[PDB]
């Protein structure tokens, strides 16, 4: 396959720097430039930087000009975006792209969060059902974590049907919070257990919360 692997994201202080990387496989076409595109939370795509197929000529968005360096190592088949004097307006998911014509191969993205806020693990509370209809609803509230992201599965991924995991919400405190819910047969509340699996990697927090009625 022709994959791109994006590394070096994470939480950074205002005025600090970042250095992202992009590794590749099998292309190596030689007529194909390397791009960096970013996406600010809840917004569209913004072009950041570009390095031409042969090295010579780089290029930058005016928002980032002076502060960014795009380079490529032809031997390791890897590109880099270094960027300095970072502000909160640089907080975004940085995408790495490559191709000849358009941008046909993308990496999955890497979140850079510019903030002097502290990393904080979530508290995970149940959304317990009634105590009554014909179908029950239950969930987990993941409160007061920073930065993003957080990951919620149910019964270690064995329960996928009826699950709605909601987008995170930035609270007035500056901490994030999200809810994940699942609708299940009320007849199976007695028999089967429902555990939400939360993981907030940034804080090393990994929690299993069982949800029962009461």
């Amino acid at each position: 396959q022709v994959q791109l692997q994006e590394t070096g994201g994470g939480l950074v202080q205002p005025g600090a720097s970042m250095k992202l990387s992009c590794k590749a496989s099998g292309f190596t076409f030689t007529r194909s430039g390397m791009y960096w595109v970013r996406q600010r939370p809840g917004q569209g795509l913004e072009w950041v930087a570009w390095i031409s197929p042969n090295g010579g000529s780089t290029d930058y968005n005016d928002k980032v000009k002076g502060r960014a360096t795009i380079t490529r190592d032809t031997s390791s088949n890897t590109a880099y975006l270094q960027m300095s004097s970072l502000t909160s307006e640089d907080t975004a998911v940085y995408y790495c792209a490559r191709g000849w014509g358009g941008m046909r191969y993308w990496g999955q993205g890497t979140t850079v969060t510019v903030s002097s806020a502290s990393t904080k693990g979530p508290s995970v509370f149940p959304l317990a059902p009634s105590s009554k209809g014909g179908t029950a609803a239950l969930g987990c509230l993941v409160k007061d974590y920073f930065p993003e992201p957080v990951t919620v599965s149910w019964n270690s991924g064995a329960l996928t049907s009826g699950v709605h995991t909601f987008p995170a919400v930035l609270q007035s405190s500056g901490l994030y919070s999200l809810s994940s819910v699942v609708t299940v047969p009320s007849s199976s509340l007695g028999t089967q257990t429902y555990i939400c699996n939360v993981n907030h990697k940034p804080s090393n927090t990994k929690v299993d919360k069982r949800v029962e009625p009461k």
Binding site: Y95, A97, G101, G102, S123, L127, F166, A168, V181
Partner: protein
């Protein structure tokens, strides 16, 4: 700068129907026969996917029901037939002269029959109340269309300013939305009142549904 204006901003369309997104460039994007205009599809929580490159070359692996066209300034991505999986934001992008620039995006909703939400209210856990805060969650589940209103009332006082809601992306499986409104209070305030309720208004309900509890009672 080649400014790309993309219209319309949002667009709901039925399965089988034709959806036409257009992109207008502030100046020409052409050299000889070639027009350097690309189309990307971003489903949420995912990187953009190349659909059409250089005006009208359908990217390999993409189905033929997608097709791009246009010259100079005016370009159009058409989808026909539209399908439930085509929920996404679509982006035009120019690669004629630096800086490379994208359009603002166009958000494609899928249409379907009206579906009322199933409303659930969740009181705060004893767990949470031990700490400073009380979070009360109202869940509107599997409804169409997206437009719904949630109203929190605490001992008959309409709350506003202390509620926050988010909405799932359209289910594709059944093309519904779901939505959670989360009312946040101090422990103190939470024990100062008895009756907590969310009233949901929605098109598929013949009059607003209210789900509530009284603090304490099972």
């Amino acid at each position: 700068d080649i400014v790309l204006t993309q219209t319309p901003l949002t667009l709901p369309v039925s399965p089988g129907q034709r959806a036409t997104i257009s992109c207008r460039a502030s100046q020409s994007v052409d050299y000889r026969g070639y027009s350097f205009m690309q189309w990307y599809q971003q489903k949420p929580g995912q990187p953009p996917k190349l659909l059409v490159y250089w005006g009208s070359n359908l990217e390999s692996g993409v189905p033929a029901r997608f097709s791009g066209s246009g010259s100079g300034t005016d370009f159009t991505l058409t989808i026909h037939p539209v399908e439930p999986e085509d929920f996404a934001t679509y982006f035009c992008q120019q690669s004629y002269s630096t800086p490379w620039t994208f359009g603002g995006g166009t958000k494609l909703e899928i249409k379907r029959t009206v579906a009322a939400p199933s409303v659930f209210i969740f009181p705060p856990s004893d767990e949470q109340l031990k700490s400073g805060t009380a979070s009360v969650v109202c869940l509107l589940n599997n409804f169409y269309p997206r437009e719904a209103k949630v109203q929190w009332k605490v001992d008959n006082a309409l709350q506003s300013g202390n509620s926050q809601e988010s909405v799932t992306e359209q289910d594709s499986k059944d093309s519904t939305y779901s939505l959670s409104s989360t009312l946040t209070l101090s422990k103190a305030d939470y024990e100062k009142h008895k009756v907590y309720a969310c009233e949901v208004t929605h098109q598929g309900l013949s009059s607003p549904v209210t789900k509530s509890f009284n603090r304490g009672e099972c």
